[PDB]
């Protein structure tokens, strides 16, 4: 038999029984990635947190030439250290401030957008596709507003993402074509005097402030492309698979419909059980480091399996059940942990909360319109998502 | 180990090594379908032809209540015998005449449509998706013209197909919703005095002719829905995967570009090697019948594996190679054989020939824009297709 291959399944509606067997038997174990590289797959809550909280397991060094790879780069190697670059340019606080859901008018914009999308689906009649015609457009609209860019520019930027977020053994020529185009777009945005709000409006101002005169135009454009992509793919994908989890729990659907004040707790549990990340989070060891029964050697690749942590019964008893009264509800790793904890966590929560609130109000009878096994799961991608999500109501 | 399950792979770019091993060892053998039923999978050219040419292996009887099933019905059971119903209504010759590619102006329409689609892709710039933005729209436009219906009605009818042609273990609620809507649409077309050309224009006339006064309005509408769906899914899917086969053979691409008069021979070979049909063709035995070393019993399900026949080296030496000078070039089973031989075979050939001619003229440098393994193959569907086909040129 060959060395255990990752990822195990592209299906995002259920966790393989094998994850629990692996966590019990070998919570750090050797695997082969799609590139043919070896890696250590970490699958218990304790060991996942250990790796994520130890910066000697480096994100930046995953981009080093000659390293064992999970998958091919789809961005320039310097862009793997995007947040480090942002910090070094003195831009971290400004970026963080631009991406909070608390910005005036933003939540009402989200609600208005969700409700319009849903009204259009109701007008057209069932079946509706909740990914392509709800969750993804909601994510796209949100991120255009957050960035300060025209809504009509969203679709073309969105269309890069089915390739930009591939998880490929080999470099992807289309990724570079789209990256270079999208960078040119963001560079134009920075020069556009009409763009005065949101993240790009703020970066535009900082660009002309003496305190940032030696920050490169490349970095400013890169922030725009990377935040649009990461935010849109992450929120669209999470909301889509959260909707599946909800639709398959009619009792929970009914409870949240009846008591919408429980939606934040529900969304936190949907985050905990979410299978949106298709691969473990990669890190490269910069030292020899003991992780459980394994001495990881300098230069080795480590993969932090989020669902390994999040379904660990030692930390989350009855891990497969959505319980709205857990004593440790935000202690999941859906947003990572440590140095690279998700900058967009509050925005991600709000997108999902508002999307779900709107859907339950407009479509309280929502149900799948096809048997669950008929969903088509995207392969060799950094997220798990159904290509279409057909529903009726 | 469990009984061998079908289908073997949803990948449409390569035949599994296992097909040849099976044909050699056990050219009729027992398998389990997605419903849990047992079936006989037939995989040699000799045995596939035998089954297809013996009407005691019945298409109609596959719809019988209580039969072992390949997959769930997505149409009313009477619609499985659509061609029998057409014949009995005296409509077979008229339907055949309406779907030939030789109709005045049709081939020029195909060429004009292909060229417009391609010009739009060139204007937008690489990468382009040759399935969603070329092959499928070309198929849809063709079938609206063939039916005599407005081009602007094509997209909505097309959108039914990702569900109508599912290969599901269980009935699909959305299939019935879309079927009933599409039937209402075709019924309206038959009543619409503006619709005077194509298949629906002819059926409209025959409907009011005394020789067809006791043919049901249900049958007339059913012909419209079934011919649109079967034709669009079959041509769109075939052309898409033929384009992959061509793109992966730069020499052949160059030869057909240089000598376009060889395109018909090329398309015949692309048909022969095509993996578009995801499942064997189902038949139910109506008698005990010897097939190779197996006595198939009355009531048993038989699956005719088209690629089993078409890659059989006993009939097609060097079966995986496209050879434009074979002595038996149309003797493949891409269009079936016998009673249920494809009514649209000439139209299917023309769609593909014209699409390929246009693509090679406009995009002689066409190549995949992503590694081939990055294509996402649709699962649990009656065809094998990539969800997107990214190319550059
Ligand atoms: C529910 C939605 C989201 C989920 C589940 C999610 C998940 C994650 C995870 C797991 C990480 C850690 C990656 C690692 O440590 O290797 C991360 C980091 C990150 N997230 Fe999110 N994310 C979401 C939404 C967003 C949004 C809306 C944005 C911005 C608009 C965003 C921007 C980022 C960025 C820029 C990082 C990199 C942090 C770093 O490398 O230091 N995310 N996210
Ligand atoms: C390259 C394109 C096509 C391919 C590969 C294809 C393939 C096939 C195959 C394999 C069968 C036999 C099914 C069986 O025996 O169980 C068939 C039958 C059929 N085809 Fe096609 N087809 C194509 C295009 C079309 C088009 C354009 C139309 C109509 C516009 C069409 C209409 C039909 C119909 C109505 C049948 C049923 C015949 C019967 O049950 O007696 N097909 N096709």
Swiss-Prot record, chains A, B:
Q: What SUPFAM superfamilies is this protein classified in?
A: Cytochrome P450
Cofactor(s) needed: heme
Q: Where does heme bind?
A: 283, 340, 342
Q: Which reaction equations make up its catalytic activity? A: cyclo(L-tyrosyl-L-tyrosyl) + 2 reduced [2Fe-2S]-[ferredoxin] + O2 + 2 H(+) = mycoclysin + 2 oxidized [2Fe-2S]-[ferredoxin] + 2 H2O
List of residues binding substrate: 74, 82-83, 234, 298, 382
Site positions for Participates in a stacking interactions with the tyrosyl of cYY = 165, 179
Q: What is its EC number?
A: 1.14.19.70
Q: What is its main location?
A: cytoplasm
| Residues under site feature: Important for the position of heme | 343
Q: Which domain of life is it from?
A: Bacteria
UniProt keyword rRNA processing present: no
Identify the Pfam families for this entry: p450 (PF00067)
Record InterPro entries: Cyt_P450 (IPR001128), Cyt_P450_B (IPR002397), Cyt_P450_CS (IPR017972), Cyt_P450_sf (IPR036396)
Cellular component, GO annotation = cytoplasm
Q: Which terms are listed as keywords in the entry?
A: Cytoplasm, Heme, Iron, Metal-binding, Monooxygenase, Oxidoreductase
Which Gene Ontology molecular function entries are recorded, alphabetically? heme binding; iron ion binding; monooxygenase activity; oxidoreductase activity, acting on paired donors, with incorporation or reduction of molecular oxygen
The answer to whether keyword Oxidoreductase applies is: yes
What does the UniProt entry say about where the protein is found? Cytoplasm
Instruction: Report the sequence similarity comment from the record.
Output: Belongs to the cytochrome P450 family.
Annotated function: Catalyzes C-C bond formation between the carbons ortho to the phenolic hydroxyl of cyclo(L-tyr-L-tyr) (cYY) producing mycocyclosin. Can also use cyclo(L-Tyr-L-Phe) (cYF), cyclo(L-Tyr-L-Trp) (cYW) and cyclo(L-Tyr-L-3,4-dihydroxyphenylalanine) (cY-DOPA) as substrate.
Q: What is this protein called?
A: Mycocyclosin synthase
Q: Which gene encodes it?
A: cyp121
């Amino acid at each position: 038999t060959v060395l255990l291959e990752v990822p195990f399944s592209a299906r995002g509606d259920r966790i393989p029984d094998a994850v629990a067997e692996l966590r019990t038997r070998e919570p750090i174990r050797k695997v082969r990635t799609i590139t043919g590289a070896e890696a250590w797959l970490v699958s218990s809550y304790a060991l996942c947190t250990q790796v994520l909280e130890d910066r000697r397991f480096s994100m930046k060094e995953t981009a080093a030439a000659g390293a064992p790879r999970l998958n091919a780069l789809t961005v320039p190697p310097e862009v793997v250290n995007n947040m480090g670059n942002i910090a070094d340019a003195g831009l971290r606080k400004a970026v963080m401030k631009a991406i909070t859901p608390k910005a005036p008018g933003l939540e009402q914009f989200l609600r208005d957008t969700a409700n319009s999308l849903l009204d259009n689906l109701i007008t057209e009649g069932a079946p509706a596709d909740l990914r392509n015609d709800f969750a993804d457009p909601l994510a796209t609209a949100l991120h255009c507003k957050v960035l300060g860019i025209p809504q009509e520019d969203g679709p073309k930027l969105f269309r890069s993402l089915s390739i930009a977020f591939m998880s490929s053994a080999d470099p992807i020529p289309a990724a570079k074509i789209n990256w270079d185009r999208d960078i040119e777009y963001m560079a134009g945005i920075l020069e556009n005097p009409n763009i005065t709000t949101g993240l790009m409006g703020e970066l535009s101002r900082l660009r002309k402030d003496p305190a940032y005169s030696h920050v490169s135009d490349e970095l400013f454009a890169t922030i725009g492309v990377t935040f649009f992509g990461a935010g849109v793919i992450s929120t669209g994908s999470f909301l889509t698979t959260a909707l599946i989890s909800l639709i398959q729990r009619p009792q929970l659907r009914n409870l949240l419909h009846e008591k919408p004040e429980l939606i934040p707790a529900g969304v936190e549990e949907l985050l905990r059980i979410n299978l949106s990340f298709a691969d473990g989070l990669p890190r490269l060891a910069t030292a020899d480091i003991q992780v459980g029964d394994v001495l990881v050697r300098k230069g080795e690749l480590v993969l932090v399996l989020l669902e390994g942590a999040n379904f660990d019964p030692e930390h989350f008893p009855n891990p497969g059940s959505i319980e709205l009264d857990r004593p440790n509800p935000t202690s999941h790793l859906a947003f990572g942990r440590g140095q690279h904890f998700c900058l967009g966590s509050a925005l991600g929560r709000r997108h999902a909360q508002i999307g779900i609130e709107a859907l339950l109000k407009k479509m309280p009878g929502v149900d799948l319109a096809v048997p669950i096994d008929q969903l088509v799961w995207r392969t060799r991608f950094q997220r798990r998502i159904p290509e279409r999500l057909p529903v009726l109501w």
